[PDB]
Amino acid sequence: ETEVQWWHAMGGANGERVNKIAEDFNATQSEYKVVPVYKGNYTETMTAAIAAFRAKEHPQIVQVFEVGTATMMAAKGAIYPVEKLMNDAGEAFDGDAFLPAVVSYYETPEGELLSMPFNSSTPVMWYNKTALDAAGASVPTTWDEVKETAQKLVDNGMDCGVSFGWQSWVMVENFSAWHNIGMGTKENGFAGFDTEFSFNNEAVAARLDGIAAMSEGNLFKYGGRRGDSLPMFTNGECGMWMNSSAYYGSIKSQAEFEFGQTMLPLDTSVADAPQNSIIGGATLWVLAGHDEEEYKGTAQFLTYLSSPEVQAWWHQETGYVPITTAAYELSKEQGFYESNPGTDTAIQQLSLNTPTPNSRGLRFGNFVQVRDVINEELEAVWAGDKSATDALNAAAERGNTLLRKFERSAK
Ligand SMILES: O=P(O)(O)OC[C@H](O)CO
């Protein structure tokens, strides 16, 4: 058998599902063996795959988070564009089948998808319904309601009211799209490499300052980057938790309480109605430099991932959105949204209203490094070391240096 190495960043429950998908494909035919290899968080996984390319130890497939897309698109010669791979191997590829938001987010300026969609998400407001009920609180729709609900929870003895993971993705990137404000110039990077950051504005700053002020009295508690704060929610310590829809699998298995999810809170001091939320998660890039049989097996595995049944199973088990309309329709016909209330929140929120350039998503080179900058500066806010105005100004300044570095090399 010819092995197809797939380096990915799926840990915990979702990682076990990756291994089930690969092995199911391996059991259906006798020519190709997909070998999934966990390489760490998204940054570690992308870094590892790129570093391996010199020693020719790089995988056939690498999962690269949405953040890394501009960098991967500029890495011409390192990637095998998926449409060319599929045609070369004799496998179908129909980009139009993917959700419109996925297509608009990932397509090149000429309308081509270079990578294979797989795990797309958006942030939702997770909540402990048991704790809300005991506190006499309601599911919030606005930021004022988030604070009031947090107060009721803590008054009723909850350790803390609200927290969030992936804080830049949630409280800067998605917060901006949800309120139709720009994240950077040149249409959040889609219109040019000469972009600069625009999130250092009064709307974002005032919200971050408001959250920091909730630390007193434990209405808010910071619980770290990425998914580090997950056990705060599943242990029943915080009653509200904003993070990826893709925590559904972990939450369903680890939470001893009744849980729900709803759309992100609206900051009514910024807007009277929400816009839409934006993509998170990753896509699958095929790397150059391998042989024909390795690519044939890669293409056949991508076909296995393209089926509505596999896409629906992945969505149902993880909380990543159904990546195609067909997978959504299959899940609906199976009664999944009736039997599991709220699992259609993420797909609805991505397409809530006709998008604007501010709500398409983001495309910034070196955004892997900018993500660290933004997390560092937000941590300075939670620690009381900087105001949000100063922290965001520093994040935009440091981020702009990274954008200029990318622009200089992308020519
Ligand atoms: O937890 P995920 O896979 O939905 O990813 C969250 C963010 O989009 C990562 O940048």
Q: CATH number, domain at 153?
A: 3.40.190.10
- Residue of 121, 228, 248 best suited for mutating to test ligand 1, as the one with most atoms within 8 Å of CB: 121
Which of 149, 196, 206, 145 minimizes the C-alpha distance to 175?
206
For residues 334 and 387, membership in a common domain is answered with: no
Q: Which of 14, 40, 378, 23 is nearest to 209 (CA)?
A: 378
Residue 344 in domain = no
Is the C-beta atom of 244 inside 6 A of ligand 1?
A: yes
Q: Are strands 280-286 and 238-244 parallel, antiparallel or unpaired?
A: unpaired
Query: What CA–CA distance (Å, rounded) separates 261 from 132?
Result: 13
Domain enclosing residue 95, as ranges = 2-121+279-339
Task: Extract the tokens encoding 285.
Answer: 């890039």
For ligand 1, the distance from its centroid to the CA atom of residue 224, given in whole angstroms, is 15
In a domain, 354, yes or no: no
**Residue 357, in any domain of the structure:** no
HSE value, Cβ hemisphere, 13 Å, CA-based, for 143: 23
Directed axis angle between helix 388-409 and helix 367-382, to 10°?
Answer: 170
Identify the experimental approach. X-ray
- Please list, in sequence order, all residues whose beta carbon lies within 8 angstroms of the beta carbon of residue 216, skipping any fewer than 6 positions away: none
Q: What is the DSSP letter of 263?
A: P
Among residues 339, 356, 388, the one where a domain terminates is 339
Buried b (16+ CB within 10 A) or exposed e, 17-55: bbeebbeebbeeeeebbbebeebeebbebbebbbebbee
Domain co-membership, 286 together with 399? no
Q: Reading across the β-sheet that carries 123-128, which strands appear in turn?
A: 160-164, 238-244, 123-128, 259-262
The number of folded domains in the chain is 2
Distance CA 363, CA 187 (A): 9
Alpha-carbon separation of residue 285 from 25, 143, 196, 388 (angstroms): 19, 38, 27, 36
Residues 181 and 165 in one domain: yes
Whose C-alpha lies nearest to ligand 1, atom 7? Answer: 280
**Within-domain flag for 58:** yes
Beta strands in 18-115 (DSSP E): 32-38, 61-65
β pairing state of 123-128 and 238-244: antiparallel
Separation CA 331–CA 346 (nearest Å): 14
Co-location of 242 and 153 in the same domain: yes
The answer to whether residues 270 and 304 belong to one domain is no
The sign of the torsion formed by the CA atoms of 181, 185, 191, 195 equals negative
Coil, helix or strand at residue 306: coil
